């Protein structure tokens, strides 16, 4: 209504960006051929945080044709090409009187109405991007975004004092985001070390001391071992005839293999529970069977006897992966020594390792890629800022 795009706190007002900007000028550095100037092009900007980080000092003689807009301390420069990339930055004082590409719209705050830092953060918002119509679907001969298009966008305008307060809150919030990323990185490192340390303790070299009552056994003693075989070609089908067939490591998923092809003549069978292990090319890699299935040349299946927990075996094989990864013969597998606690202690220790393993996995995923996390979290902060909610 009278409220504009959305309702602002008391005392704020809606204006076009241009209404709080000043005129800007151009200069041809080639007119002082022996004079160095500093040039800010698109490549000079880190779009993730909106900072001029790599401008180039250039001899006037060699000024690029786009090098014509004079920038001043506190200007915001806003690329009119691909605006969604956020090549948008605040000009520091060291760059006063230097030059940026004509590809930037130069937004110079009229300090009677707007703080440069407030304009900078405002201009990084999707709220501005989303107003630039020439960025949306284009028909024949539609012009690209112009400087006037940018100056014409609507912006919420608090009093100067509140602008400065909002700038401080936005910058502090963004710094906390960085702090958390660093912390996560540290946790990832320490948690991985924890897992590695825990496995090394419970899985000592054969013959090493084990708590009384544990025994060193050969896997063959507490595990049925089945070497996979290639059935006759022509017994494979996709009609669900027989059992899913897994040739080798390639046919393994994150934890369990997913059925792709069947074999009507199941030769070597693995059941739910059994651990699958690659005995071929990438030796030692592991999965667990979740369905009755059959295995080929590339796999062995290990079926724990009653004195051995599936997951104790799995952790051990994973811990041994570097050794196992130098084919693998039945006798090899049967001859592997494993320390064997009573079932209750295997389960107690597996519960502990499971907690760490889940934490390592979570920490791995919780670290989002940098450019995306920073740009989209920035946007969520700006949305709060420009509604008056900070």
Residue numbers in the entry: 1 to 326, 335 to 398
The authors write:
Restriction-modification (R-M) systems maintain the integrity of bacterial genomes by cleaving foreign DNA. Type I R-M enzymes are composed of three different subunits: a specificity subunit (HsdS or S) that recognizes specific DNA sequences, a methylation subunit (HsdM or M) that methylates target adenine bases, and a restriction subunit (HsdR or R) that translocates from the recognition site and cleaves DNA at variable positions. The HsdS subunit consists of two globular domains that correspond to the variable target recognition domains (TRD1 and TRD2) and two conserved regions (CR1 and CR2) that separate the TRDs. M2S1 is also the core DNA-binding component of the R-M enzyme. Together, the M2S1 complex recognizes an asymmetric, bipartite nucleotide target containing two specific regions 3 to 5 bp in length that are separated by nonspecific DNA sequences of 6 to 8 bp.
We report here the crystal structure of HsdS from Thermoanaerobacter tengcongensis in an open form conformation at 1.95 Å resolution. TRD1 and TRD2 exhibited very similar folds. In TTE-HsdS, the CRs were found to be composed of two long antiparallel α-helices, forming a coiled coils motif. The two helices were held together mainly by hydrophobic interactions and four hydrogen bonds. A three amino acid loop (Gln375–Glu377) is inserted in the CR2 α-helice. And there is a fifty degree bend in CR2. Although both TRD1 and TRD2 have similar folds in the three HsdS subunits, the overall domain orientation is quite different. Compared to the EcoKI-HsdS computational model, significant bending and twisting of the CRs in TTE-HsdS crystal structure enlarges the angle and distance between the TRDs and also shows a small range of rotation between the TRDs. In summary, the crystal structure of TTE-HsdS shows an open form domain-orientation. The potential open state model of the M2S1 complex was proposed based on the structure of TTE-HsdS.
